[PDB]
Amino acid sequence: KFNVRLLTEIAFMAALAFIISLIPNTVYGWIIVEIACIPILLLSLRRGLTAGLVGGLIWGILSMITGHAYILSLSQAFLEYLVAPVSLGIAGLFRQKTAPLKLAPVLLGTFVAVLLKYFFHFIAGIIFWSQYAWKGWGAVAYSLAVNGISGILTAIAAFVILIIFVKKFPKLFIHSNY
Ligand SMILES: CCCCCCCCCO[C@@H]1O[C@H](CO)[C@@H](O)[C@H](O)[C@H]1O
Ligand SMILES: Cc1ncc(C[n+]2cccc(CCO)c2C)c(N)n1
DSSP, X not given: OOHHHHHHHHHHHHHHHHXXXXXXXXXXXXXXXXXXXXXXXXXXXXXXXXXHHHHHHHHHHHHHHTTOSOOXXXXXXXXXXXXXXXXXXXXXXXXXXXXXXXXXXXXXXXXXXXXXXXXHHHHHHHHHOGGGOOTTOOHHHHHXXXXXXXXXXXXXXXXXXXXXXXXXXXXXXXXXXX
């Protein structure tokens, strides 16, 4: 967990997440597949909770200071661009330090982290985005559909990519000095 290498990986994955976040990802309206979560999920899985949290923090800051965040208020910004991307760090609780690498924990951490992130967007949807609720939908129903569907699709893409990495590059997930 040597500091320079550790800090470098953190910076690298936050930057990567930011850069991937520049790829168009809209399916319909605010229904998206947030492939940009993946670098942070990988960072968390490999390096653990704290690193993941910090990587998420950095990515969220980047989103906002480069003008790519959609901000409606300070509270909403804090929730959706600090709390939400930080919360991806929870994948770090499912880190595996010892080989052989198992698939299940990678999927569990991913599922839990994407769920938690989209849980905060869901809340945010109720509070701040209800004006956009499709005709005839109430605020909770709209937010669940929107953020529920985005969360699932996002978990799908994370699953696909991370499953390829587990089969191809299992070592991405296991940190070692040496
Ligand atoms: C106005 C506040 C901005 C300054 C406070 C710290 C900025 C957060 C990012 O820090 C570093 O910045 C590099 C370029 O910004 C990133 O590429 C790198 O990943 C990151 O580690
Ligand atoms: C109903 C609804 N619409 C929009 C948003 C905003 N939102 C949703 C998902 C992810 C993100 C972060 C950038 O990908 C944002 C800002 C919402 N929460 N709910």
